[PDB]
Amino acid sequence: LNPSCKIMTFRPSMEEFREFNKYLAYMESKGAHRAGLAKVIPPKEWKPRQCYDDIDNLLIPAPIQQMVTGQSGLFTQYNIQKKAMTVKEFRQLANSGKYCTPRYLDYEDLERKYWKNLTFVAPIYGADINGSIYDEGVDEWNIARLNTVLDVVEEECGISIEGVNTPYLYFGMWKTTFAWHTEDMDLYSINYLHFGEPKSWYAIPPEHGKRLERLAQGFFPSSSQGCDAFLRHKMTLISPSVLKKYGIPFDKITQEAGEFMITFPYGYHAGFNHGFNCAESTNFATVRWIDYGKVAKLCTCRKDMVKISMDIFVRKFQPDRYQLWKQGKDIYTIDHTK
Numbered sequence: 001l002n003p004s005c006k007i008m009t010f011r012p013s014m015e016e017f018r019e020f021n022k023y024l025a026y027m028e029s030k031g032a033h034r035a036g037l038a039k040v041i042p043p044k045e046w047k048p049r050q051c052y053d054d055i056d057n058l059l060i061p062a063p064i065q066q067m068v069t070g071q072s073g074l075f076t077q078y079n080i081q082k083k084a085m086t087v088k089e090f091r092q093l094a095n096s097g098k099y100c101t102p103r104y105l106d107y108e109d110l111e112r113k114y115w116k117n118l119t120f121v122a123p124i125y126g127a128d129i130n131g132s133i134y135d136e137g138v139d140e141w142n143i144a145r146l147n148t149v150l151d152v153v154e155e156e157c158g159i160s161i162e163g164v165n166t167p168y169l170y171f172g173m174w175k176t177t178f179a180w181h182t183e184d185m186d187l188y189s190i191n192y193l194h195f196g197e198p199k200s201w202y203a204i205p206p207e208h209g210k211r212l213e214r215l216a217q218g219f220f221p222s223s224s225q226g227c228d229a230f231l232r233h234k235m236t237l238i239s240p241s242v243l244k245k246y247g248i249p250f251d252k253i254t255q256e257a258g259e260f261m262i263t264f265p266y267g268y269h270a271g272f273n274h275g276f277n278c279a280e281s282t283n284f285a286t287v288r289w290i291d292y293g294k295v296a297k298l299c300t301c302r303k304d305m306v307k308i309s310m311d312i313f314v315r316k317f318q319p320d321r322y323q324l325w326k327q328g329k330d331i332y333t334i335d336h337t338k
């Protein structure tokens with residue numbers, strides 16, 4: 001039941017690893033979702049790509065320079081768009097003295113340096129690049145074709161998933177940040193770190209996610225006035241020192257190359273890259289997600305934010321609740337421990 005809500009790490013055998021959907025069910029049966037985030041280390045024999053050398057030639061169309069402002073563990077970011085550059089050029093930039101990882105003793109030391117140096121040199125990243133870099137034919141844990149409930153309603157029912165169930169690439173360098181957020185529509189996500197330096201993650205248990213929202217609303221009241229769901233803008237940073245000071249439960253873990261991270265519905269997460277790296281990610285859903293999607297607090301202020309109609313999911317997977325839901329009478333409190 002994982003009542004401590006701590007981030008679990010799973011080490012499946014190849015036999016266990018072959019079927020992603022069965023293994024995810026197993027992870028939740030052990031309470032992994034209560035932490036908001038879990039790590040899966042594949043068996044050492046498994047490789048999604050035999051050789052990454054040709055990824056050097058991949059063009060990053062719109063590299064982003066991350067501009068962070070603030071102090072005392074509380075920051076907002078904005079983005080400056082740079083001219084396109086290849087992965088090779090990006091790697092050379094990341095490894096240059098201006099941008100490279102500092103010397104550090106251990107991951108805790110590096111974390112301290114991250115939070116102390118956020119407002120000096122602005123790092124650069126590539127994100128939301130369409131595509132997968134798995135080899136063709138890889139049938140296990142293939143982020144481009146996970147066969148979850150999102151794919152069912154798209155293929156069988158003709159429902160638009162708004163591109164959320166397709167793969168994206170992220171190229172990181174030292175100090176590049178992903179700000180606090182849940183996924184679009186409070187979906188799951190899966191993240192594979194193909195190569196390079198690690199990625200550190202913070203996660204808040206879903207059963208405490210409202211506490212993070214209230215804390216952020218108190219510290220960013222202008223942001224909050226402008227959008228009920230302003231954390232979805234992915235521009236808000238809050239250090240673990242601030243979380244500790246206000247008693248918000250959280251956990252932290254570092255993802256190494258070759259490891260998966262799964263985020264769970266309404267699992268707030270944030271983090272940073274240690275150095276040059278490449279990750280691939282997508283969103284997905286299970287039936288347990290549907291009650292989260294029905295209640296997800298959506299971005300008020302900008303018109304093109306991702307919105308998936310929940311009607312098909314209730315109709316097909318919650319038939320006994322469908323008419324009550326459309327009546328506006330399907331009122332409930334989610335039990336995150338279930």
Ligand SMILES: CCc1c(C)nc2c(C#N)c[nH]n2c1=O
Nearest residue numbers: 125127170172176177178191273
């Ligand atoms: C800094 C690039 C980047 C972004 C924007 N988002 C994430 C992410 C999530 N969620 C996990 N890594 N990651 C990134 O590296």
Ligand SMILES: [Cl-]
Nearest residue numbers: 101102103104
């Ligand atoms: Cl240094």
Ligand SMILES: [Cl-]
Nearest residue numbers: 102113114117
């Ligand atoms: Cl630094």
Ligand SMILES: [Cl-]
Nearest residue numbers: 228229230231
């Ligand atoms: Cl929010």
Ligand SMILES: [Cl-]
Nearest residue numbers: 168281282283
């Ligand atoms: Cl994603």
Ligand code: NI
Nearest residue numbers: 182183189269
């Ligand atoms: Ni995310």
Ligand SMILES: [Zn+2]
Nearest residue numbers: 227299300301
């Ligand atoms: Zn908004």
